[PDB]
From Swiss-Prot, chain A:
Origin species: Xenopus laevis (African clawed frog)
Function: Necessary for the recruitment of gamma-tubulin to the centrosome and for the formation of a functional centrosome.
Compartments where located: Cytoplasm, Cytoskeleton, Microtubule organizing center, Centrosome
Quaternary assembly: Interacts with gamma-tubulin.
Gene this chain is encoded by: tubgcp3
Protein name: Gamma-tubulin complex component 3 homolog
UniProt similarity note: Belongs to the TUBGCP family.
């Protein structure tokens, strides 16, 4: 929970945080690498992704 | 991570002041005033890149403030010395915001992002000051030759209002010495040269012969006048 709150900050400030999304011409929304977690981790990173492209531009 | 981000906020805060921090080491390899900044490896490589683009800001703070103290120490009467005084009092406004958010550091919750917003205006202030300083190292001008270079920067830095306002003020702070040396030559004819600020040198002879070394903010027509 809170680590994902901290993780979106470093991408808001710039380039990626706790894990490494990098792949700016290959986007996979973020890396989390977890499948036993809920599938709403797959969509909260979709809102995380449409802001970092507008930050690097 | 969020405790690791806040100490990279505090270690960067000392980098912007000009002193060398703990996790970010500063080293000049070049004769230019800009020193290199190396961040150490972190437990998360993301923030290490995010702090890495805020290191070009103290690159620009270390650029112009070493220039204005080298200009001040190797003592001149020149307009390049009075140029450095207009840059020094702007450094008072830069150092006073950093101390005000440190009152919020005892209540410490400030971000890598709330700090990132305030540094993009103050990279703007420092990058223009660095790019004036970088032009002055390549130039080696003084007197009216500096006055015409600063008059050209009032032309180019238009479109950004606040980059125009300092480039105006730097020109106005370089001309109020120079046109006072003009006026002190008009009321008596007192030609004093600490390092030949004014163009006209003392010669029966009638040999005041303006110089081609220097020119006022206007063209040679007002220098002949």
């Amino acid at each position: 929970e809170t680590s994902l709150v901290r993780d979106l900050l470093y991408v808001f400030q710039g380039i990626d945080g706790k894990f490494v999304k990098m792949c700016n011409s290959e986007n996979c929304y973020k890396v989390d690498g977890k499948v036993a977690v809920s599938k709403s981790l797959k969509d909260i990173t979709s809102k995380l992704s449409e802001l970092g492209w507008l930050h690097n531009k | 991570l969020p405790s690791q981000e806040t100490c990279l906020v505090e270690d960067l805060l000392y980098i912007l002041i000009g002193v060398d921090g703990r996790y970010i080491s500063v080293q000049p390899l070049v004769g230019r005033q800009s020193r290199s900044f190396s961040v150490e490896q972190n437990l998360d490589s993301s923030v290490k890149e995010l702090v890495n683009r805020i290191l070009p800001v103290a690159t620009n703070y270390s650029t112009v403030t070493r220039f204005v103290e080298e200009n001040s120490s190797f003592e001149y009467g020149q307009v390049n010395h009075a140029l450095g005084a207009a840059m020094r009092t702007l450094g008072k406004e830069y150092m006073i915001l950093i101390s005000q958010l440190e009152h919020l550091q005892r209540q410490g919750l400030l971000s890598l992002q709330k700090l990132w917003f305030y540094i993009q205006p103050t990279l703007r202030t420092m990058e223009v000051l660095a790019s004036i300083a970088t032009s002055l190292n390549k130039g080696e001008c003084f007197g009216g030759a500096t006055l015409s270079l600063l008059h050209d920067r009032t032309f180019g830095y238009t479109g950004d209002s606040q980059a125009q306002e300092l480039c105006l003020y730097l020109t106005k702070a370089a001309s109020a010495p120079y046109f006072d040396i003009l006026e002190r030559w008009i009321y008596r004819g007192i030609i004093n040269d600490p390092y030949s600020e004014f163009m006209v040198e003392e010669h029966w002879d009638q040999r005041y012969t303006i110089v081609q070394q220097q020119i006022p903010s206007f063209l040679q027509k007002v220098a002949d006048k």
